[PDB]
């Protein structure tokens, strides 16, 4: 920096070092809080696909999954039977 000293005399490091440190500490604390506690809670991956889920949300999700699977299986079977019956009736 040409005339680096004259340029950096007034503000070598910070204008309000205390406030800069408070900003850094708040940012660090908030990142810690979010990542460690808040986002994992919302994601709810601790008991994901657990065979014995103790969480109501996970139990509801597994219920939705099994119910959708049962619906798809039943409808596929019924449609196959219906198509077979129609094909049999066609050749008469």
């Amino acid at each position: 920096v040409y005339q680096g000293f004259k340029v950096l005399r007034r503000n070598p490091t910070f204008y309000n070092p205390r406030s800069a440190g408070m900003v850094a500490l708040s940012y660090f604390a908030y990142s810690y809080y979010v990542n460690k506690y808040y986002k994992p809670q919302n994601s709810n991956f601790e008991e994901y696909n657990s065979s014995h889920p103790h969480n109501h949300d996970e139990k509801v999700r597994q219920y939705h999954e099994k119910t959708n699977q049962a619906i798809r299986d039943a409808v596929l079977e019924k449609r196959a039977e219906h198509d077979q019956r129609l094909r049999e009736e066609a050749k008469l």
Binding site: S43, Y48, I71, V75
Partner: protein
Amino acid sequence: SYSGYSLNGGVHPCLPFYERMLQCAKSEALPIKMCTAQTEDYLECHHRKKQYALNYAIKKELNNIRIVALPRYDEENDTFVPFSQATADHIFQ
């Protein structure tokens, strides 16, 4: 809208799932309940929630003490050799 393009002018990776979902929705008389499989596949290809859950589980397992040494990969023969066996390409040798 769903343009269906990639970031280099190609095809969006979700396009097959999106086409399947739209086809099912048009065909079915009860699209909401009868297109669950296609819609879930599209949402998975879009959000990747299941892969993130798998990664979370794998991170927990790695944190737990169960794995010591993975087998080395012999690239010349495209095989896997146990870490115990010594090879010329082995780091420790």
